């Protein structure tokens, strides 16, 4: 995954052959492990973008992208 | 239940195709893979592939891609084995095989096996044996037991049937598998007896060769000088 | 590919003894922990049965004598006590493709020398411009033996076919033909043959030899 | 995940923790390579269970299940 950023905060494009895989990236504050758990498609036109919640020994409710380290935002196509 | 159920044994000429079934029993069929092992006279076990009767997909041996071709026929639950441009070495048993199982596993396993089929490529035709009564040495052997042997060359197909005296003389017997000798199969036996036996009492070779429907008696007689 | 190596070609064992055999992959037919290598008797009449699947799971029916392991490459047969139902090719299998090992024969005694007699040409064959000379040589243990043919001296080696029997239900021995074939036109031209046993029962070997015109 | 099988054709039961890894397992035609790209949750009552197509050298479409050698179903559910 393509890693940027949005308003400061960390940004993750990911691609396809990324489904079901941690995704990991470093950050001044150690490594951060993001979980994707999405409709996770092929990179195309059709992109949703949203929030990857801070969870810290909470289990995840009503989501499917989280990291434990610090929040990241996540944006994939979902076309196929 | 879980059988497999073979053809019978064929008699094909060189160049020509053979195209041996399989029939299975006691389990899906569609569930299997079936496999199709080889064996040469005095050689190991050698694979032939292994259909797969739901999709049709099937890998051979390198060995045998092009002269080999596996099918099946799921409403017979019937797999069939054809072999093209045949030659003397294509001679051997071939095997059906379950592979047990179902892991998406290697097993590799063969845990149900046919009959087996055997083929045999054969140019030569039918030819009766001759036979050879084999006589000691010109003035006999020392010792107290005498060795008498029984040559049978040049025959086509196996088998023959040799015996001694019709069948009474059947102890100190060894009658050696047949071998080859230009496209014709050659055979011996010797029999061994005290010496107050021979030559005193006759000793008989008696050699029977169904294909060409023959039955030939060759008395063993001492040998004189030239 | 994968080449099954197995090791030794035949094993000779007595009753009571511990037979092992060994199978030498190339490629470690090993995956996801599992090892995908498989025992396989075989009686002559009969087609293989499977004794040891995934390298140690002794099939349905087999008797705990068998027992197999390995990992890798490198996989072993064990007999434990050997019984006369042994008696059998063994071979090895891989299941990641279908090869199989060059199977192991496995055989069932005191050291017997061979009783050798040889036998001129009969005169019917005579008769057909073709000669054989055949040597028996019978009831020997063990199996190792090699013949020598000479024909006034000089050794031959084109022509000569020799048989086996199968190791004799009751008394444990082989025996052999040994057949040295040549024209009668060349078998008329020599005197003297002899065929030669190389065995382990004699330092040198026996030696049957006629001379063609004698009596 | 185990390893069974549908009518002679290899079946996957996928777990949870399986999500976002390649999927591989031996088969007498060499080692077989499924990509699972599924809403993939805790196997339960609620499982879906369908088939992984083989394909060569060809783009995936209309699919989050797709295998290199030999066809494969697979079956896992949905709760979370």
């Known amino acids: 995954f393509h890693l940027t950023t949005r308003n400061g905060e960390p940004h993750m494009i990911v691609s396809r052959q990324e489904k079901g895989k941690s995704l990991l990236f470093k950050t001044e504050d150690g490594v951060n492990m993001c979980t994707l758990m999405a409709d996770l498609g092929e990179l195309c036109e059709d992109t949703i973008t949203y929030k990857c919640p801070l969870l810290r020994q909470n289990e995840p409710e009503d989501i499917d992208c989280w990291c434990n380290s610090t929040s990241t935002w996540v944006t994939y196509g979902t076309c196929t | 239940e879980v059988q497999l159920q073979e053809s019978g044994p064929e008699l094909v000429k060189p160049g020509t195709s053979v195209k041996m079934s399989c029939k299975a029993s006691?389990?899906?069929?569609?569930?299997?893979?079936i496999h199709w092992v080889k064996q040469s006279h005095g050689k190991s076990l050698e694979w032939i592939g292994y259909?797969?009767?739901?999709?049709?997909?099937?890998k051979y041996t390198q060995k045998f891609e092009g002269r080999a071709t596996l099918t099946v026929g799921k409403s017979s639950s019937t797999a069939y084995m054809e072999l093209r441009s045949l030659t003397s070495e294509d001679s051997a048993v071939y095997y059906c095989?379950?592979?047990?199982?179902?892991?998406?596993?290697?097993?590799?396993?063969?845990?149900?096996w046919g009959q087996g089929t055997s083929l045999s490529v054969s140019s030569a035709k039918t030819t009766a044996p001759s036979v050879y009564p084999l006589a000691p040495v010109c003035g006999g052997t020392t010792g107290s037991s005498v060795t008498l042997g029984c040559l049978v060359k040049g025959y086509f197909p196996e088998p023959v049937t040799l015996t001694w005296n019709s069948g009474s003389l059947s102890s100190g017997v060894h009658t050696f598998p047949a071998l080859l000798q230009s496209g014709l199969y050659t055979l011996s036996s010797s029999v061994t007896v005290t010496s107050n036996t021979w030559p005193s009492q006759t000793i008989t070779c008696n050699v029977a060769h169904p294909a060409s429907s023959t039955k030939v008696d060759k008395k063993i007689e001492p040998r004189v000088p030239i | 590919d994968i080449v099954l190596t197995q090791s030794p070609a035949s094993l000779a064992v007595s009753l009571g003894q511990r037979a092992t055999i060994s199978y030498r992959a190339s490629k470690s037919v090993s995956t996801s922990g599992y090892s995908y290598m498989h025992w396989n008797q075989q009686k002559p009449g009969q087609p293989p049965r499977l004794l040891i699947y995934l390298v140690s799971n002794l099939e349905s029916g087999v008797p705990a004598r068998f027992s197999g392991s390995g990992s890798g490459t490198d996989f072993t047969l064990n007999i434990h006590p050997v019984e006369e139902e042994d008696a059998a090719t063994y071979y090895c299998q891989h299941i990641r493709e279908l090869t199989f090992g060059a199977a192991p024969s496995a055989a069932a005694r005191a050291d017997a020398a061979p009783t050798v007699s040889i036998f001129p040409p009969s005169s019917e064959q005579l008769t057909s411009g073709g000669a054989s000379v055949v040597c028996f040589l019978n009831n020997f243990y063990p199996k190792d033996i090699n013949v020598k043919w000479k024909i006034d001296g000089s050794e031959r080696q084109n022509g000569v076919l020799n048989s086996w029997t199968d190791q004799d239900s009751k008394d444990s021995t082989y025996s052999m033909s040994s057949t040295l074939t040549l024209t009668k036109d060349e078998y008329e031209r020599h005197n003297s043959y002899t065929c030669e046993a190389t065995h382990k029962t004699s330092t040198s070997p026996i030696v049957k030899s006629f001379n063609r015109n004698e009596c | 995940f185990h390893l069974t099988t549908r009518n002679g054709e290899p079946h996957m039961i996928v777990s949870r923790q399986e999500k976002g890894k390649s999927l591989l397992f031996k088969t007498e035609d060499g080692v077989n390579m499924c990509t699972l790209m599924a809403d993939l949750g805790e196997l339960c009552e609620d499982t879906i269970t369908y088939k992984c197509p083989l394909l060569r050298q060809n783009e995936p479409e209309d699919i989050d299940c797709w295998c290199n050698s030999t066809s494969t179903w697979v079956t896992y559910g949905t709760c979370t």
């Open positions: 095989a379950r592979s047990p199982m179902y892991f998406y596993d290697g097993s590799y396993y063969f845990d149900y």
């Open positions: 006691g389990y899906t069929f569609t569930d299997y893979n």
């Open positions: 259909i797969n009767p739901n999709n049709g997909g099937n």
